Amino acid sequence: ISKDFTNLLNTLIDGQIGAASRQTEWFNMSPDERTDYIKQVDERLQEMQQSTLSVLAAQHFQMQDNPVSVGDQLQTLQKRRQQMTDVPGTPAINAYKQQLDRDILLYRRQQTAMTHFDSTWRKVLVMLGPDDSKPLNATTLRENAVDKQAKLDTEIKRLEQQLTIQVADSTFSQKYVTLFSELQAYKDVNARYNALLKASATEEAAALGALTKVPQASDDLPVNISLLMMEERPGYIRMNVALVNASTDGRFKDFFLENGRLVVLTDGVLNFSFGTAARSLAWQQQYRLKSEPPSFRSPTYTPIRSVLVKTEFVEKYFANYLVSESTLRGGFKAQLLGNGRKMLLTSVDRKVPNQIGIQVSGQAPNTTITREVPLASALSDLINQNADIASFRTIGLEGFRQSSYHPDRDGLFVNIHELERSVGFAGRQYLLEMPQDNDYLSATPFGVMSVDGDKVSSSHLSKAQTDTLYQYNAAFFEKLEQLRSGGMKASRLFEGSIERTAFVQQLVRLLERNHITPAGVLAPEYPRDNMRDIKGNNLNKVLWEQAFAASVWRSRDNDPLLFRLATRLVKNPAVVKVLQNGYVQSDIAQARELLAPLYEQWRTRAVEAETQRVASANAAQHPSNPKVHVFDQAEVERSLDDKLLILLLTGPQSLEGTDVQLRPMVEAALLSNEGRSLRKQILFHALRPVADSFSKAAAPVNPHAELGVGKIMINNRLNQPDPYLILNTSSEEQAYRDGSYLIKDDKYRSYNQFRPDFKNDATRYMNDLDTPFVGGISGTTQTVSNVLTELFGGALSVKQYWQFQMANAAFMIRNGYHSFFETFYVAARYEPEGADSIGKEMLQMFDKYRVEGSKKALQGKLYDGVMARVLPIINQGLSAADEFHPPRFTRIGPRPALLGQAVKDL
């Protein structure tokens, strides 16, 4: 709001632009984007105050050990609040107080409900039991049956009536929770009593146990009381169902409002869930409670569909499922709807309670045979009966349409909006500064980020470090909070103040540490060629290279060459080494999913091997050890993954024996787009260890004078791992434990480990061309292309060569391993000698554009210069209708091609 804060932001913006080299996350903005940027700066600063400094305060204000107990939760929270009612007002403090208050309310409600449940249970057991002239026993309970079953029914009816009246109450209340707990107690005791009456002589003692076993240990709630605690308003639970994507064309499961009625787009969806989390994972770890398993949060990340539904419907069919306690459940349950239809309930998660797979099915309307079939309309109508028509909403829908607009791109993120939409997201974790070291460092509220050339870690904070971090950061945020309101008069950051300069020097590095920079947040509709990506690469060239990689990847053109390569390569013994790579294990899991019937049949074979292991361990003479008298999980898992790898490299023709009966299915699978793309994505990962296994020395065939004769200046990287981009992709919650941890090596880490070494001549060259930079000149591509004559066992045609090398370059761009240029440069250096070779020209063209780029923006001219020379060699055999043509670089963002495959019927 304050004009002074706005002038300060404009000052630091202008100054940081003026200081810029090439490759910077700042760039000059439109005079409209300026305001959206400042608005997002202010918003995200408020988010920081509410959502990271608050949780840091909740670990500074721990200097005295309050009374703490896992059972006395309500009292522990209450005294934690009374510890801090004296603390001065501050937004992080107010947010902490309000969170603790709401959690106090919830725990109070739950404890009340459990108490009145227990008292009602005891009361009903006294009512059903005999007089004190006899002990409570099954015989007297049976003698009581004919009267007190009807008494139980009468009380149940009365309670249901009174509670249905009380549902008119506008908010949760003592009477509401009371009557609810009574109704649940009466229902459960009635059910257990009737089970006892039905119990045989062998069951009777167990049913009497189940009656006398009050849940007074409070080790888990009554299920219906858990549903009560999930109620968003008295008598109603919030249902939700999560999409794969917004299904405007029917490709995805969906559930949407159509003509006032709610409509499921498909006959069942695996992705329903009920309730909502009471607090973020940050607060969950601050309380040091168990965090909800990630299999709830992992499976989808796009906007989610939700409405309030009548709790009676949920508790009728779905309370049978929703129990957190391990009641025996299979893969499925089938529920008779009163209209004669089935509803199928599906155990889509074997640990989490509150997410459900649901399907309705029944006798197909208006058909010659009474086949039962799934029925989306029946489910829609049943929901519309049980739903409230009011307060249907889609979570984040405008956010999606105002940041992604649609499923945007087939490649890595470009700004934080695409990151937060990406599968890697989990929750936005801002970092803050730990400046009392000799040079400034980044810490979470739980731990300071250890960084190393090989490794990234956090050391958890001891108390002195928490006091340092809190007091410093709080003093800074207090200054910022003053500046927004009391202005320069209050903050005393006068224009000549050394304190003002220190403040700005801190703010700029805060706004760098989190990618709140303009390239991080602006996400424009049509990218001006001035703008730069989140790493300071030119935006439009990155977009174009991604669209190129996508188009090359989707084409079916190179596949006859690549699968010949794979068919030969699979014979090398070294290919086994590929499977122990950490990144391959990301994607063979998807092959385990695609080939589920094979993955199951194979595993059902493999589990046999345990029997031979135990047999051999018993056949060994006088075994002094259970030498292998165990189920070795790792052995079978390795052998299974090796089988799946081999079945992915060589074609389905490799199938043999009984599995030939399944071979037509596997053939239909592997020829899908996801099949081909997996097959070649695993092929290219398999290529590197085989290439390395020849250990042939470097020997480029085209010399180049500008960049050192006979060598290449490969790799060319400085290891400078970005902590924010690491933590804002889903590491395990082991990072969040308040305990020291070593972070996962996700595939994006290869995209985030590296920063250009501006001292190297190769960097100077590339900065002259002003290409994007990702991991430097690709020594991997050198090592591969040096041995192609041995991989294929003979010289390639320049057509076959350039085909393979473009598929490789598309693979490198798709996974974010390198730029276009970082591959094609070493290609042109390695292109075989021959009558149609073109690398000599390509080198001279690079030099020609270098001597320009040091003065002028090339605006994609380099890419056209390359494609002009490559395309007529690739398409040399093809008809003009079937040629490949990449998307065409333009001032506006990359537009679709106008020729060949890309138009044919697409």
Author numbering: 4 to 909
Paper excerpt:
To understand how Mcf1 is built in molecular detail, we heterologously expressed and purified the full-length Mcf1 complex from Photorhabdus luminescens and determined its structure using single particle cryo-EM to 3.6 Å resolution. Since the toxin proved to be inherently flexible, we performed a series of signal subtraction and local refinements of subregions of the complex. The resulting composite reconstruction allowed us to build 92% of the Mcf1 atomic model de novo. The structure reveals that Mcf1 is a monomeric, asymmetric protein. Based on its overall shape, reminiscent of a seahorse, it can be divided into two parts - an N-terminal head and a C-terminal tail region. In addition, we noticed a large spherical density of 10 Å diameter in the middle of the head that is coordinated by five arginines from all three head domains. Its location at the interface of the three domains and coordination suggests that this is a negatively charged molecule, which stabilizes the head region. We therefore call it head-stabilizing element (HSE). Interestingly, these putative receptor-binding domains are arranged such that they fold back onto the tail towards the head, resulting in the C-terminus of Mcf1 to be located within 2 nm distance from its N-terminus at the neck region. Moreover, the C-terminal region forms multiple hydrophobic interactions with a helix bundle of the ABD and supports the helix that directly connects the head and the tail region of the toxin, thus organizing the neck region.
